[PDB]
Scaffold this active site. Structure first.
Site, short mmCIF file in Angstrom:
data_model
loop_
_atom_site.label_atom_id
_atom_site.label_comp_id
_atom_site.label_asym_id
_atom_site.label_seq_id
_atom_site.Cartn_x
_atom_site.Cartn_y
_atom_site.Cartn_z
N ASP A 62 0.85 -1.18 0.00
CA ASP A 62 0.00 0.00 0.00
C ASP A 62 0.88 1.23 0.00
O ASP A 62 1.13 1.85 1.04
CB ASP A 62 -0.94 0.00 1.20
N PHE A 63 1.36 1.57 -1.19
CA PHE A 63 2.30 2.67 -1.32
C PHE A 63 1.66 3.95 -1.90
O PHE A 63 2.35 4.96 -2.08
CB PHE A 63 3.53 2.22 -2.14
N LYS A 64 0.35 3.88 -2.17
CA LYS A 64 -0.40 5.02 -2.72
C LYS A 64 0.41 5.81 -3.73
O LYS A 64 0.58 7.03 -3.63
CB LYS A 64 -0.92 5.91 -1.60
#
Ligand SMILES: O=c1cc(O)n([C@@H]2O[C@H](COP(=O)(O)O)[C@@H](O)[C@H]2O)c(=O)[nH]1
Ligand SMILES: O=c1cc(O)n([C@@H]2O[C@H](COP(=O)(O)O)[C@@H](O)[C@H]2O)c(=O)[nH]1
EC number: 4.1.1.23
Lengths: 218, 226
Positions: A62-64
């Protein structure tokens, strides 16, 4: 993808020992773990490789991802090299930024999840007004995996309308932020749950409890 | 610097160090150190080499370090990211404004507590920025002003937009600008509005990064000092 019990753990503890221990406690309930920057910045990208190896689980990074195309490419390559099955990418920076991620994912046999609308109050300022168009952009790009907010099931319904029944939709905001697991799963394929589980006195009991509450939806 | 109350950046030039291995990143940064004292480190290098690359840069070069992490999560997660980043020794962090005021405020609160700086990213330099970000950019900038943000990022590729962004944030704000060089932005035109330009590949992929940096500096020499 097939997420066990329709429940994804958001592992946002920031210490490797606590993260490993708590993930181990709930592993019988959850086969898909979301790892983000709180854990990765604190312990290094190697933590993704370690989790996949130890737990034999799916890992969503979840590195957006929200940069220009060339930098997005570099981020995706580094992330997939570490063994992540998928990466979460913001849609608001536009189609070239998303396409760069899709290209790397195709090259390495991984998946991109497109974040269309966020769960927090501030999402109403700019993201919500663009969310339908971001979702449509995703459809045109060939995106098959999406993220939308448990805190706004009417927006999840609308997102589901745009992406269709065959696309995969996961949804954070259940538990701590006020979203309801059962209602969210009317529209989303899986819910993401963080603190309600990892800060519980008994994380296994918390996970089991959430699962019991959605038992008829499994 | 242009004002006594803004970040002093040597030669108005910030290195975007997006090489992805420690040996090359350290070599190139060392080679250009007489021209540049301010380094932007992003996820390409941090994900590849770890947050301790910040420690190594501080030790070897004593440079100011801007962590370009484009922070873009919910407030609670933003707080965690900012805490980890400043704990590692970053002087400043870059945060997206698109996720809204509460997400930005979370970062500002951490920076305030920890004695560091936040840069607000208002409009981006790539063509995709025109789809959603550009239409929100003026409002994102005004949001920054309302929140007390003093440091901003805006695109070298669109000086006509930088002109407008400078109007909103005022002369007392500090503005840095990527997209100069490789992406087609012009250093001189950008520095009409920005305090400093960010340059990556046209330096770090050059046969001689020091010569590339010196060449950029020569091209803008009329704009240097103070
Ligand atoms: O819109 C979104 C998108 C997210 O990825 N998230 C992420 O989902 C997780 C939610 O955790 P929690 O159940 O503790 O609220 C966090 O990792 C957060 O960064 C979110 O909360 N809202
Ligand atoms: O709008 C923006 C914001 C950025 O941070 N950047 C960053 O600035 C740098 C630009 O590098 P380059 O000079 O190689 O194009 C990269 O690190 C990129 O991620 C950008 O290019 N445009």
């Amino acid at each position: 993808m097939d997420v066990m019990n329709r429940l994804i753990l958001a592992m946002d503890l920031m210490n490797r020992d606590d993260a490993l221990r708590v993930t181990g406690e709930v592993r019988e309930y959850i086969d898909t773990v979301k790892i983000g920057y709180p854990l990765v910045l604190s312990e290094g990208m190697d933590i993704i490789a370690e989790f996949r190896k130890r737990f034999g689980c799916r890992i969503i990074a979840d590195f957006k991802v929200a940069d220009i195309p060339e930098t997005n490419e570099k981020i995706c390559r580094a992330t997939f090299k570490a063994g992540a099955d998928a990466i979460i990418v913001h849609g608001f920076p536009g189609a070239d930024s998303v396409r760069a991620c899709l290209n790397v994912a195709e090259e390495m046999g991984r998946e991109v999840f497109l974040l269309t609308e966020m769960s927090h109050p501030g999402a109403e300022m700019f993201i919500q007004g663009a969310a339908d168009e971001i979702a449509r952009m995703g459809v045109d790009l060939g995106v098959k995996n999406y993220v939308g907010p448990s805190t706004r099931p009417e927006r999840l319904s609308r997102l589901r309308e745009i992406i269709g029944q065959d696309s995969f939709l996961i949804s954070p905001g259940a538990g701590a932020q006020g979203g309801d697991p059962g209602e969210t799963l009317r529209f989303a394929d899986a819910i993401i749950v963080g603190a309600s589980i990892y800060l519980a006195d008994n994380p296994a009991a918390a996970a089991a409890g959430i699962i019991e509450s959605i038992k008829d939806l499994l």
